[model samples]
Target: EELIKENMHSKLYLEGSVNGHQFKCTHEGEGKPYEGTQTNRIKVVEGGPLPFAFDILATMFSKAFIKYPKGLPDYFKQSFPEGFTWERTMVFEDGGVLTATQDTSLQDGCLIYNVKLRGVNFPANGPVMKQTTLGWEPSTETLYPADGALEGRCDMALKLVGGGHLHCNFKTTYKSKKPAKNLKMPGVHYVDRRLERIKEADNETYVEQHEVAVARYCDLPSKL
Candidate 1:
């Protein structure tokens, strides 16, 4: 079926949980002209201390638009008519080596999605920290007609070379459906009432205070 007219079929399911650790990731393959070999599995539900079992051997590439069309507007120049990019190059299991990138376009009317993270040898080393620089900047959601479920909330950092930063405030949600083979783990007062309704919703600005050495690891870094 020519992959259903070149939309390249995809199905991802991502869950959340920061400090107290709890993650769930899944991606079922091809989507658009993005090259293949994508395998991710980040099932870490261990109450924290950071030691995710690991398994992300990606190799994806993109130029955007795997499928879009769903209530457009908010600045549309044909909505990404060749103005988006997605890149990946992960390989961790011990030999850490990450390189992620996402760049969305449409400047004037507004539509920006920028995320970048570079890494090297990160099997969770400590004391003299080695090197790292991860970051995530998300906010603008809802793309024109491209429905499959996607949520927002971001701002995650983790700079370490010795100063050990480790920031937080991340909320995620994604779905294309495909995650059932006995998957369960979402309690803890229902994830603290969904992080207190996304920290009393509004239009951002929710830093409750921190800096006692980063609140001693994380005493609710804005509830992850």
Candidate 2:
């Protein structure tokens, strides 16, 4: 919230997505394709998976559940720190380098998190809440958060390959294009053309490759 006021209303909020299906952007009958025809649109979207990340994090704090000192309790601390566990993960879009820095204090250039402590308290998981049975399931699916919390949880990481490490923070929210399940999804592929040499050119090729329509966004993690 401070960032909003401090940054002069620079807009950068994204919408949420579910499944690969939920993470798609379309300007179909408008924009570049139509050009002077009456559609010229331009926007930078940080939506889908990223927004979903916020939902999940929000649920963690809003929902009522049982907790433990190990997984939920432990992980929860990492998300909602006392004074605030400062973190900075620089993600370079150019060469794709991900550099992560955590627990560092900011004197001049540090990432400051002035967390307000009014009703800030993580619930405990025990006889009331089982580690694996908290209202939320904890899974190990980083590709996609499990359907529910407590069942399973995701430890943020990267699909490092040709691109260097994309700084990933377990508590930080991010948006990225991934999953590749869109190939099997039921809808229109973002790219389709005829005389324009076309991309992928076919569902098989598109879904198998060109269907790049996935993104991730997250916030500093928190607990219930």
Candidate 3:
């Protein structure tokens, strides 16, 4: 009701522009693991001089975002260089936390939660859906898959490492994703193929909620 109208004018794609470059996602299907061939079909200009990827993003944010037909000249067609993937954070009881991503292989976290975004250029380094996003910031405040096997929730701490290999040093009070037994982590969830923001996670990136039993989806309020 109220939520619907308030967000009626908001943009799709959870996308935005930076000084010019934007990780725009014309996402096809859900962001998931093993979703091979995921892609972001770049709509390009036909007769127009080929613009750099950064230039394209700038053009959109400056005028395209507000203008219809997106100021992108007709020369462009549905093309792609890559796409986006949802990430998940792994929470443990003793405050040790980890994360498994779609592209990259598992690191020092829980059994690597896998979800593949298509067309993504796998990173040259160890694990990755793409190298670029590995260090891509603004990853702040997002929901993640924390579902444990079956259903279960574990209390957690925010893991953050300012600088250092596997520096997950930042700690804060929070709830674990698997609030119940048998609930899968990054549990298989896709909205029309496009991965949803994980169970109980929110659209804004950093959203907090409390555990729900396997039979409940109720939103429990927590102080932190």
Candidate 4:
């Protein structure tokens, strides 16, 4: 009640790894409050798989799921007035990357994302070495309030090296929890301005491996 009444907001943290390339990234940035565009720089705090070293860029998105601890449906919808659109770029050391890629409008009441690998140097069972065709369909998710997590299943289809379709249903879950102030990471940049400060000095190095996206909040590890 108090949160909704005043429209409270706080920082959001993401920590989880998917199958396929088994790429894991742990990052945090300012939570986008209602009614505006929020720009966040996703820095690979830990490790980059391979061939893909450290890179920096802002991932701008407005569709947010705000956990309304007291509100029904568990979260608040912050889709843009017209709808929600997401655009991100995947930078790789080889320069063959997904640039200016946009997910179709997620305005029709369904949280949708279609991720397809269309460039070379993409990761496979291991780090991407050549052109690999592997992607995940839209996710089918289930929320577990008791455990404070959102689990999802998806059909991962991969084109084999010799001419075969490797298809399987993969399972992955992310726990969500309130941010812990006590778990502050030194030199973590949550906004572009802070990154700019580091850039001004021209001496900041990006770390590519977090080893594991373990839990940072209460009991729950790396709440996605």
Candidate 5:
């Protein structure tokens, strides 16, 4: 048997809560050992709320290539790789539907990805925030690989109707393996900040912030 298989796959798992809403995301796909394109569907197994659902999807893609220490594959290193883009539609139990597209590329030893919220439609009698509008403002995530570890930060913003907004400054660090000198493994950190106002007439705005830390790597499945 070959020690290093030519066709291999990577599995990624993320479990965390955004604004107190618990969520778990996963992605698995096959590629050329540590390179090439891997087409897979990202799913939110639990706690997928509006506005933030797209955030979870984007995070999965960011974590997908953590196992590859060499950064993105050759396909993304071409002069004009055309880039990679994918779309997903989420249907909620309350008849609300959300569609989004994610575009990704590798540049300067870092993985750069952008998420676009395409369409958002909630049933008239479904949720309380009927007139509430949602949008994205050039949100981006840049992940860099170095010395068997991946580090990155996300600068994202969500525009809500009535002049309300949510901004997230998330940072992540993951090591492929434990360090020789230290038994402790690296972890991930999420720092979120929000600014909001119910309506323009309210003439009031508040800021909310929170930080969380968790083991960066999750147990991979036996088979992919």
Candidate 6:
């Protein structure tokens, strides 16, 4: 929840390919790799008392990380554009000692490169459903197709805002539209569509989790 709150504002999109017996789906929008463009979607200016929980998981593919695949590369450096800790000392299994240090400033990292996108635009002119929400919104474009043999996925390269370009791949599952419910005592109004999926791997590795993106908003945690 804290990490989610850390982002002051965010935009979202639906882009992926569906496998038709190992075949697939590709999506295109307005002559572009259709990324969800709900410009003013999320604005987490404050925190609430809702009982939310967070589980931190590491990725299988990274240029930098200490535990599993320990190394510092452009891939690891890109994720932390603002800056990150990159020096440490450790002991080995056979009583060996090792130490490492490196700089990950934006200048030393990768920049976004190629981006493959797929998926449909949200809130497809559907019936307006109003319900109490974590953030306020005008209507809902939330939906989920049956069996959804259809799917969304992506593989791409991006220059991490930090500097160099890194690789990324994402996958997702479907969820029935979420009903409206209150999540705040005070909030602003917004609109949105919801899609849930997982970010599969970077360079073909183990990384699993269902990701949900419900694009909505609050004018401000306190009406800024």
Per-candidate TM-score against the hidden true structure: 0.22, 0.17, 0.19, 0.28, 0.34, 0.19
Write one digit per residue (lDDT tens) for candidate 5, span 22-97.
5555554344423322343444555543323242234334232222332222212221223344444544444444
Pick out the ten consecutive residues of candidate 3 with the lowest summed lDDT. 59-68
Alpha-carbon runs more than 4 Å astray in model 3: 1-12, 20-25, 29-35, 43-180, 184-224
- Position 56, candidate 1: lDDT: 23
lDDT of 6 by residue, 33-111 (tens): 1122211211111221111110101110011211111121121222334332222232212222223232322222221
Report the lDDT tens digits of candidate 1 across residue range 125-201: 63212324322222222221123223334333343444544443333332222232322221111110001111211
Arrange candidates, best TM-score first: 5, 4, 1, 6, 3, 2
lDDT values for all models: 0.29, 0.20, 0.21, 0.28, 0.37, 0.21
Question: Considering summed lDDT, which 10 consecutive residues are worst modelled in model 6?
Answer: 53-62
Candidate with the greatest lDDT versus the true structure: 5
Q: Name the top TM-score candidate.
A: 5
Compute the lDDT of residue 26 as modeled in candidate 5. Answer: 54
lDDT of 2 by residue, 76-163 (tens): 1122212123222322222221222223112232122221111111123211111121112222222222221112123332223343
Off by over 4 Å in 4: 1-40, 43-49, 52-71, 75-137, 145-150, 156-170, 173-224
Q: Candidate 4 vs candidate 6: which has greater TM-score?
A: 4
State, as a TM-score between 0 and 1, how close model 5 is to the true structure.
Answer: 0.34
Q: Using TM-score as the measure, name the better of candidate 2 and candidate 4.
A: 4
Off by over 4 Å in 1: 1-29, 32-69, 73-81, 85-116, 120-224
Question: Which parts of model 5 have CA positions greater than 4 angstroms off?
Answer: 1-6, 48-51, 61-170, 178-224
Candidates 2 and 3 compared by TM-score, better number:
3
Better of 2 and 6 by lDDT: 6
